[PDB]
Structure formats: structure tokens, C-alpha cells
Design a protein around this ligand. Structure first.
Ligand SMILES: *Cc1cc2c(cc1C)nc1c(=O)[nH]c(=O)nc-1n2C[C@H](O)[C@H](O)[C@H](O)COP(=O)(O)OP(=O)(O)OC[C@H]1O[C@@H](n2cnc3c(N)ncnc32)[C@H](O)[C@@H]1O
Ligand SMILES: *Cc1cc2c(cc1C)nc1c(=O)[nH]c(=O)nc-1n2C[C@H](O)[C@H](O)[C@H](O)COP(=O)(O)OP(=O)(O)OC[C@H]1O[C@@H](n2cnc3c(N)ncnc32)[C@H](O)[C@@H]1O
Ligand SMILES: C/C=C/c1ccc(O)c(OC)c1
Ligand SMILES: C/C=C/c1ccc(O)c(OC)c1
Lengths: 550, 550
């Protein structure tokens, strides 16, 4: 196709054309869209940032290509090398709040790996795992399990929503809510196309399945894995798996994810915490309970405005233009039957064991006056618990999409520091975050998701994506929480596109030895710097720091 | 000093002699030894492989050097990059069975990091971790907890002996026997000196601790870590940590390791299995018990001779010079009241929970005919249950050292394939391995250790290090088994010095793609190839493959 809206850097129009002509020859014109519209969650955009904090067309694709299979990927990459054409690989592109499917560098070909590379590759029962291609959503896989009577033997692990890529999310090191909630941790045996075009599998993926007649002359892409590939991550030698999560080191085409066996007993629950300051003692209680396997999963501590926004928009609670007061949140608390904070957990296993745990948990949260315990049955039917009852047993839902509409043309953006699993520290993070929010005039909205020794603090910034004063005030808000949080020893675990640079600039111990060593590994595997340049602040040498850093 | 037995490649007497006087000026002569003796476990050698299968002097150092502090290491690294000198960084060198301290390339300096770098830097109770310099053995750290009555709050996780380096083991991807047995996956935040000489801290350890008067003007090395440095491995960006396990990509100077809080109740146990055959049905039972969480640690499945060898040498069972018959092991089994395979585990937490689990396990294993269940109390003073009942609660011990002395000049070598957790696979592998040991004229000795979805199969080759006819047969055994298991789809998880190249060539999916990529990264970060050339079969460009591989 003829003439695009932004060309990649140093590339003439002539080339872009002799390039996209060559891509069209391989993939067919059906699998190429050249850009010369925000959409929705269900039909996600592949061109730009749908919850945009910078101008709408700031991070913008030049093309979008949907490779049919692994070989088309090698063919594309070969070409990208020949033309020095940056590539932005996506799986589903539902990475909203972090940029969605937009390229960090405008002009890049967005690689729609998920459109056609779709297959649930294997579901293995006795080894309790699955292999997945980029195009399998959480829902795709769920329906795979149901339509195979498999929901009786194995369970999933889902984020808040069901539309996200299984492998896409995992390489982002994202987080879910059962005992198998550490998604990256649950991987074994990845397949990757390298910057140079070669296919690599990792771990025991590197151990070939022994020759037999059935598998002869199969393209490497299409070859089976040897037994232990998806059972043991480490293989032998240096353990390079993690070079492919939050990286531009590779394009991931296959991943193994371990699936949790049906526990033979399930029960979700809600603990409501009356006062705002009950976060402090709550976290303090969750701490020995996490480290000692009374809490089996990844429980969440939600802010009252998180649940409030799922149920109804802002305009239905107050007409005010400024943020909500402390009295007015107690009013939304007493209203919905929730606390200021709300702690959602789940128990897994046979009744005998659930029994003891639950008494231990109840009897621990009892030192907080006015506390209240609910099973899903006890609550209203539109309740958030009644949604997370599904979420913490591996069932994909979409109800939690509703909080994005807490403001007119709603858009979210995550500020995601990590805090100690100590009540003192969590308050500190809160008060530091809560303060700047009120300065930018945003309401505070967030969850703590409870890891073993860590808490992901998801500060949910919603903003009117068509209010230009406010978008700029969020930018100022973000850039400041980052710096503030650092000045207090907190770094963010994951980053939006426009804060990649700054957040990375945050981990500068010993004069940025981490980024330097990272850069070194980038230039070695991607000589011409074509895979996802700029991702996580890692820039190859042909991209000037002065020109490209934000 | 002046005249070693072996110079490194390409390096003159005069050059070596300058390097050596130079190193002496930094570290002091009482930290430098030039070599111009096999030691014990209680005092390990630093020059060569003490359980040598190759000639005794085959893997040999030109000298040992012991840096006092991290700056020393940098200084040394810089001399090595100047003179083109191979380093071989150890912590303790108790890698008996895998080469001990021996340098893969002879003429290397062995860097004894543990001799002075020695300290438990931290033990944090709320965080339930520690920070550890290379020299902190398991016992050392155990003793550190006792001197602060922390034994009552925090528990270790330990390998079969107490001598190993906490981080030595950890970066070899070692294994122990509590809920915390996967040692590598219990690190957070490590410190590395790169081949270039620059100091790197990984993960959150790259977010620096914010400034305050009390820490002003400290060298990088001595600086505190930010609050989330040993709580959250991932940090931000590409996750390089695994690049430093079982590789030559740096010298580790510190590490964080998670510590398990006292569970509040602990019972260990021995289930014995009568027939050689029972191995099969046993493993099928393990599978759901492991996968559903009835089995909380890494339990092991032990071959009779291992136990037997703990209790006396071979000469204490038969004057036989050749392998013990199948029927003789039946005699031995009954002799000390064990089965032909023995299962050891433990239960963690309060009485109510342990009960329910320890029933779930009784019932499951009872399907095996002639089964028998022993708590520690039920067995004789000398028991392996008694030794292990300490081990699966993080107590250092040394009893299991005896089995090394099954044969007159007993030395052990490990063959370490992974197996699925399936009785049918386990049996196939066992059969492949037993057969070959037989053709080699050796007693088959071995444990499976139970990972969640895989089994570590340690075939324990013990042999008489002065028998040359035997040395050669173990050499034939090892190399035959490696291949055999590859032909049946099974890779080795960890390697001895003499088998590193071969093991790697086993992981040759898609025309050795895994090795090649590995070599790229290596050469990038080690322009001069001075860090441990040839570990894991990963050779820098200056080391020609023809000259250097076995
Ligand atoms: C809006 C929102 C988001 C959200 C959430 C709740 C709401 C209402 N709750 C989440 C949660 O509970 N847990 C979680 O991890 N994320 C949460 N989010 C954020 C986000 O929506 C989800 O994480 C979502 O699953 C991520 O989107 P997706 O799975 O579609 O990933 P992607 O769009 O493809 O892009 C992710 C990044 O990964 C890299 N990538 C992806 N595939 C490849 C391949 N195969 N090769 C190389 N790199 C790949 C890209 O760099 C891209 O930036
Ligand atoms: C003889 C024996 C061995 C044994 C065992 C039982 C017996 C009777 N049981 C083991 C077990 O249960 N689990 C396990 O993982 N290993 C077992 N072994 C083997 C061995 O005894 C122990 O594993 C021991 O812990 C290993 O020795 P050590 O901990 O002392 O390690 P090292 O010799 O100092 O070094 C080993 C390799 O690690 C790399 N290394 C070490 N230090 C560094 C630094 N600081 N930087 C970078 N790399 C480092 C080197 O590659 C070195 O060769
Ligand atoms: C709301 C939930 C959420 C949003 C973004 C994230 O990155 C995340 O990971 C812990 C959780
Ligand atoms: C016998 C125990 C043992 C020996 C060597 C190893 O590498 C190991 O790790 C699983 C365990």
C-alpha cells in the first residue's frame, strides 16, 4: 500500500513500499494493513495507545502484519534486517494501561502474532501443563478445556479479564489470582525467533525429541518437544529464559504454562475492613499468613473506589468536579456493604483442610473491630466477590472492565510500585501516592496483590482521554510518583510506553550498571536493532539516546 | 612465586610471573599459592578434581587466589583482562562429584571467593530471607541462626551435606528437601562482578537505597540494598538473573535467599517399598500427591544400596569384588529392615493439617503390597530416617558422607538425568541405567528426588580412584549413559567437568541453536574470554573448539 502516516527512522518511502510489497507477497494482502481509531476492548486496536496519555497518534504504527505461521515470522524478520525496519511484536494487544498494542517507536510494523498463530498446541493431563501460541486468550483456553471435559482435572489462572494473551501476559511477567498466579513462574519450554532469524527453544526445549518415522522432515517450527521440555524449566547450562520477558531479545512463538490440578475443594471469600487505616493492621496480619501457606493464592486488597466503579460511574455517587472527601467514601462504604479496604481471598483443597485454614484466617482478622466475613452466597448478586469467585478458580470474566468508566471517556494507566508485605510500608506507599493524586485532582484507586514477600500496588489512574488539561496532569502525576517512590526505595514492576525510559532510569544503582549490561546483550543479538527498539528503556546503538528517550 | 606445573594457554612464564607479583601486591602473599594432593570434604582442595575420573592432574590450576573484599575481585578481573588470564571462581569448591574446585581449563587461577568473603550480611525476620557472601556454608549459616535464637523463627533448606556454599549451591541450581528445596528459585537480588570488572546488582537490587548520612561515601560493594531487594526477584525489564546460574557470565559476590519461617509443627517419615519393581506404582502415586500438594517438600526415593552404603562399606556386606546380585540386595533390604526402594518425606505445619495430609499419603501408598511406615522414633540409632529427619528441617549434617566410601578409594561422580513423574518413564530410565552400570561392573546406586512435575535422578557412581581400569570404565559408562538417555529423550540437569561439552551437545535442538546464542552473549560480555572459559560447554572465540572440547 501507497503512503503511510509515519515512516520508521532513516527509511525512505521507496523502501517502505518495496518492503510492504515483499511482505504482501509472503503473507498475502489479507494479512497486511497499512495506516494512511480507538475502538474497544473486544475489538482491540493494533495501531496506537487506546487509553492514550500522550497525543493519540504519538505512538503509532506504520503497518500491521499478521504472520500466518512460524516461517512467515522468519521471512518478515529476514526482511526487517535487510531494510532496518523496526518490528513491534504483539500477541493479542490488550495491554491497555501500559500502551496496548502501540510501538514505542513510531513507524514500526506491529506484528499481529495472535491473529493467525492461534492454536492451543497441547494440553497434557498427567504433567498438568499446556503449550500455547500467541493468539490464545485466557477465554480461548477456557473454552478449550470445557469443550474437552477438562475443567474437571485442570484449572486456569486468569488476570482480571479474559481477553488477554496467555503467553503475552506471561512474558510481561503479569499476575493472576490462584496458587498459580505468578504467570511467568509457571512457564517451561519457550519457542523464540531471534533477531537474526533463527529459531530457538529454551530449557529442555533444547533437548531434541528422538527421531521416529511420524516426525521426519517436519519443519523445526512444527516439531514435537521432548518429554521433559514443559516439566522442568532449567534444562542445562545458563538459564536464558528470563531474557525474553520484558525484553526485545526475542519474538516468542510458543510457551508452556503449567496448569493447576483441580484442588478437590473450593471456596472464595471477602473480609471487609471498616476504616481507611485498617490497611495497616490488615497487611500486618496477611504477612505471617502468606509466608506460612494459610493463604494459598494471590489475594487482593481493594480500594473502595475499585468496587464502587465496577458497580456505577462517578456521576451516580457525587456530582463533584474535585476528588472525593474522606467522609464521602465512608458513605460509599456503608452504602455498598463494603469497607474502605476489602480483602478477597480463596481456599483450595479438601474440606478438612479448608476448615482449619478458614478458622485461622477468621480468628486473625478478628483483632480488627467491626470486621465482617462473607462467602459469595452471603452477598448481593452484582457483587465484586461474585465475580472474583470465578476469577480465583480460573474462570474468565469481563465485569471488571466497568471501572474504567469512572470518568466520562474513561482510560486507565497503571502506576505499579512494589511494596513490602508490612503494614507500615504499605501505608507509606499509600500516603505518598494518595497525596500526589489529590494534587493532580484525581481520585485514588488501587489494589495490593499479595505475593509471598512482595505486594504489587496497582495504582489505577483513570482519566478523561479527551480532556487535554487532565491528560497533562496525569503525565505530571506519573512522572512524579515514579520519582517520589524511588526517593523512598520503591520501583515499578512494569511500565507504560511513555514511562519505560524514566522507570528504567530509576534502577540506576552504580551508575546504571543494569541498563549498560542490558544494552550490551541487546547489541550482540540484534546487530541492526530491529526487534522492539526502546522496550524497557533498552535502546540498540543505532538509536540515539538524545533523540529517543522520554 | 615463579614456576607452576601448567601455564594457561598463550601465556609466558614472564607474563605469569608479573601477573603473580601484581596479584600479591593487592591481596597479600598469604592469599596466593602457586602450584609447582586430594584433601578431604572437611578441608577441600583448590587445585584440581579430588573425585577425579580423568588423570589426577588433568584439571589443574596454575595458582589459587583469595580476594579479601569485592574491590580485590575487580582488581584481579582487570589483571586477567590485561594478561588474558582464565579465572575459575569458586565459593567453597565442595562440588565433589562434579569436579570439585578444579578449573575446566588447566592453568586457570582458581578464585577462592569463600576464604575471606565469608559473612552473613543479613538476616531479616519480617522479610524471611538472608544475604550471603560466597563463603557462608550451610553450617555457617545454620550456626549464625543459633547464636541469635532465630532458629525458633527461621528455617534453612539444605542439601545432603552441611558443607556446601549457600550461594555456591544456589547458582549451580542445587537441591534440598524442604518446601524450599529448589535453591535457585529462592534467590532474590544477587551481586555480580562482570568480566569487564563492573559491579552489577540484579532485580530490585538495581533500585538503589535512597540517601541518608549513615551510608554516604560507601563503595558500591558496601552499600545497603533497597527495601524490596530480597523480596522480589523480577525487578523491572529483562530478567537476567538466570544468566548467572550454571554459566561463565560473571563472578557472584553476594546473594539473597528466602528462608522458611518455622512451620509450627514437623513430622518426617519413611515409607519402605519391598520389590525392585515397586518403583513403578510408587512413582504413579507420587504424581497426584506432589501435584495436589499432599507432599509439601522434595521427598526422595532411595535405592537400597544408598542407604546400605550409609551404614557400612561394601566389604561389610560381601567380600565380592563385583556388583551385588539382585537377590543379595534382597538379603540386604531385610538385613536392616528397609525395602528395595525407600521413600522419605516430611509434613509441615500444625497438628490438624499434618494429620489429614499424613492420612492422604498413608492411604495412597498402601496400594503397594508389603508397604511399611516408620516415624523416626520407630528405627535404630544409626537410621537414615534419623539423619534425614534432621535434613528435611534444615539441619546441617554429614552422615551421608559414608556412602562415598563404598569402595576402597571411594570417590563419587554424578550422572544426573531428569525423569517425568511417571512410573513407566522412571522404570525405563532405571533399566537403561542399571544395565549400563552392570556392563561397567559397578553397583547401581541412586535417588530420584521429587520435583513438582519432574524427578532429579542422581545415579551415584562410586569408584576406586587408583583403579585405572575402573576410571576408564566409569568414563565409558558416563559417556554411554549420556547418549543412551538422549536416545530415550532425557537430558542431564547438571554436569561434571569431563562431560560438560558432551552434555551440551545433547541440547542441540535445531542445529545446536541453544549453544550458538549462548556463545554470542558470552563473547559480548567477555571480549577477552577470561571468565571460566568452557563451563557448561560455553567457549569464547579465542578457545578453539577443536583444541578444547571433550
Ligand atoms: C485495563 C485493565 C488491564 C489489566 C487489568 C484490569 C484492567 C481493567 N488487570 C490485570 C491483571 O489483573 N493482571 C495483569 O497481569 N494485567 C492486568 N491488566 C493489564 C493488561 O490488560 C493484561 O495484563 C493483559 O493480559 C495484557 O495484554 P496482552 O496479553 O494482550 O499482551 P500484548 O497486548 O500482546 O502486549 C504485551 C507486551 O508483551 C510483549 N509481547 C507479547 N507477545 C510477544 C511475543 N510473542 N514476542 C515478543 N514479545 C511479545 C510486547 O512487547 C507487548 O508490549
Ligand atoms: C559428594 C556428595 C555431593 C552432593 C550430595 C551428596 C554427596 C555425598 N548431595 C547433593 C544434594 O543433595 N544437592 C546438591 O545440589 N548437590 C549435592 N552434592 C554435590 C555437592 O556436594 C553440593 O552440591 C555442594 O553444595 C556443591 O559445592 P559448593 O556449594 O561448594 O559449590 P562450589 O564448589 O564452591 O562451586 C560450584 C560451582 O558453582 C560456580 N560458582 C561458585 N561460586 C561462584 C561465584 N561466586 N561466582 C560465579 N560462579 C560460582 C562454579 O561454576 C563452581 O564450579
Ligand atoms: C487491576 C489489576 C492489575 C492491573 C495491572 C497490573 O499490572 C496487575 O498486575 C499485578 C494487576
Ligand atoms: C544424592 C544427592 C544428590 C547428589 C548430586 C546432586 O546434584 C543432587 O541434586 C538433585 C542430589
Amino acid at each position: 500500500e501507497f503512503r503511510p502516516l509515519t515512516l520508521p527512522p532513516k527509511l525512505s518511502l521507496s523502501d517502505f513500499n518495496e518492503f510492504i510489497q515483499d511482505i504482501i507477497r509472503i503473507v498475502g494482502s489479507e494479512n497486511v494493513e497499512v495506516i494512511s481509531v480507538d475502538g474497544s476492548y473486544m475489538k482491540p486496536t493494533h495501531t496506537h495507545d487506546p487509553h492514550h496519555v500522550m497525543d493519540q497518534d504519538y505512538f503509532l504504527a506504520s503497518a500491521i502484519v499478521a504472520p500466518r505461521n512460524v516461517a512467515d515470522v522468519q521471512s518478515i524478520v529476514g526482511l526487517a534486517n535487510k531494510f532496518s525496519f523496526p518490528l513491534w511484536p504483539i500477541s493479542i494487544g490488550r495491554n491497555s494501561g501500559y500502551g496496548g498494542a502501540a510501538p514505542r517507536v513510531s513507524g514500526s510494523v506491529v506484528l499481529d502474532m495472535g491473529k493467525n498463530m492461534n492454536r492451543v498446541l497441547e494440553v497434557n493431563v498427567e504433567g498438568a501443563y499446556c503449550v500455547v501460541e500467541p493468539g490464545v486468550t485466557y477465554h480461548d483456553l477456557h473454552n478449550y478445556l470445557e469443550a474437552n471435559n477438562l475443567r474437571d482435572k485442570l484449572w486456569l489462572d486468569v488476570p482480571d479479564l479474559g481477553g488477554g494473551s496467555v503467553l503475552g501476559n506471561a512474558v510481561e511477567r503479569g499476575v493472576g489470582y490462584t496458587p498459580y498466579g505468578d504467570h511467568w513462574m509457571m512457564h517451561s519450554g519457550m519457542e523464540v525467533v531471534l533477531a537474526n532469524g533463527e529459531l530457538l527453544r529454551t530449557g529442555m526445549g533444547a533437548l531434541p525429541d528422538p527421531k521416529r518415522p511420524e516426525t521426519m522432515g517436519l519443519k523445526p517450527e512444527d516439531q514435537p518437544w521432548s518429554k521433559i521440555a514443559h516439566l522442568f524449566p532449567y534444562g542445562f547450562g545458563p538459564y536464558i529464559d528470563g531474557l525474553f520477558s520484558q525484553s526485545n531479545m526475542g519474538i516468542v512463538t510458543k510457551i508452556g504454562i503449567w496448569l493447576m490440578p483441580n484442588p478437590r475443594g473450593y471456596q472464595s471469600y471477602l473480609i471487609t475492613l471498616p476504616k481507611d487505616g485498617d490497611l495497616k493492621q490488615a497487611v500486618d496480619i496477611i504477612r505471617p499468613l502468606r509466608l506460612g501457606m494459610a493463604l494459598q493464592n494471590v489475594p487482593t486488597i481493594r480500594h473502595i473506589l475499585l468496587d464502587a466503579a465496577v458497580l456505577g460511574d462517578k456521576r451516580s455517587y457525587s456530582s463533584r468536579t474535585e476528588p472525593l472527601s474522606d467522609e464521602e467514601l465512608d458513605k460509599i462504604a456503608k452504602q455498598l456493604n463494603l469497607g474502605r479496604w476489602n480483602f478477597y481471598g480463596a481456599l483450595y483443597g479438601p474440606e478438612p483442610i479448608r476448615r482449619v485454614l478458614w478458622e485461622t484466617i477468621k480468628d486473625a482478622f478478628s483483632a480488627i473491630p467491626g470486621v465482617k466475613f462473607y462467602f459469595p452466597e452471603d452477598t448481593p448478586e452484582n457483587s465484586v466477590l461474585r465475580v472474583r469467585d470465578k476469577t480465583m478458580q480460573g474462570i474468565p470474566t469481563y465485569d471488571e472492565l466497568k471501572w474504567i468508566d469512572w470518568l466520562p471517556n474513561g482510560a486507565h494507566l497503571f502506576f505499579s510500585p512494589i511494596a513490602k508485605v508490612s503494614g507500615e510500608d504499605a501505608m507509606m506507599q499509600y500516603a505518598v501516592t494518595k497525596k500526589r493524586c489529590q494534587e493532580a485532582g484525581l481520585d485514588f484507586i488501587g489494589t495490593f496483590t499479595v505475593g509471598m514477600r512482595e505486594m504489587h500496588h496497582i495504582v489505577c489512574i483513570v482519566f478523561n482521554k479527551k480532556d487535554l488539561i487532565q491528560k497533562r496532569k496525569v503525565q505530571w502525576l506519573m512522572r512524579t510518583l515514579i520519582d517520589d517512590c524511588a526517593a523512598n526505595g520503591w520501583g515499578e514492576y512494569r511500565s507504560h510506553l511513555a514511562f519505560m525510559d524514566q522507570i528504567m532510569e530509576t534502577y540506576n544503582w552504580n551508575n546504571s550498571s543494569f541498563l549498560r549490561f542490558n544494552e550490551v546483550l541487546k547489541n550482540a543479538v540484534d546487530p541492526n536493532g530491529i526487534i522492539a527498539p526502546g522496550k524497557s528503556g533498552v535502546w540498540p546503538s543505532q538509536y540515539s539516546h538524545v533523540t529517543w528517550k522520554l
